Amino acid sequence: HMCDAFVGTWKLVSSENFDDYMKEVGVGFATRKVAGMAKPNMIISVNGDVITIKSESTFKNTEISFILGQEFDEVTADDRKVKSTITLDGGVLVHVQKWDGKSTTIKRKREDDKLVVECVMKGVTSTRVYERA
Numbered sequence: 001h002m003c004d005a006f007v008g009t010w011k012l013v014s015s016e017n018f019d020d021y022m023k024e025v026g027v028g029f030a031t032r033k034v035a036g037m038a039k040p041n042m043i044i045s046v047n048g049d050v051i052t053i054k055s056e057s058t059f060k061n062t063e064i065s066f067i068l069g070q071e072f073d074e075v076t077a078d079d080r081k082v083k084s085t086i087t088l089d090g091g092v093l094v095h096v097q098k099w100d101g102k103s104t105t106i107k108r109k110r111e112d113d114k115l116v117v118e119c120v121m122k123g124v125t126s127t128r129v130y131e132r133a
């Protein structure tokens with residue numbers, strides 16, 4: 001029942017500062033433009049201890065499955081090969097990605113009827129807001 005409030009199908013309704021976040025991450029121009037246009041569906045499900053997060057969009061479809069606290073390999077939508085660890089901290093899913101001596105942290109939280117995603121790469125934060133589909 002750990003992530004019950006996250007489970008479901010969510011649609012992107014707002015994005016702020018995503019281009020700047022992607023710049024800081026090292027995403028090149030053409031990927032930034034196309035990825036920044038995407039309006040993904042996020043699908044979160046749980047089966048036992050395994051959490052699955054899918055993103056479906058016109059740009060890329062991605063899927064990760066993981067157990068909290070247990071590192072895994074992830075190929076991101078922008079084609080980074082990262083080492084990821086996701087934990088629950090005070091009801092917030094905290095996802096850290098490590099690659100090439102760099103790190104970014106993505107937090108996913110339930111706030112009212114929204115799922116709020118905050119992405120940080122050094123000093124730069126982007127906020128992406130999802131509602132139920």
Ligand SMILES: O=C(Nc1ccc(F)c(Cl)c1)[C@H]1CCCC[C@H]1C(=O)O
Binds near residue numbers: 060061106119128
């Ligand atoms: O955006 C994401 N994934 C994702 C997948 C497939 C795509 F095509 C595009 Cl563009 C993005 C997540 C990962 C990076 C930070 C924001 C997160 C989110 O909003 O759900």
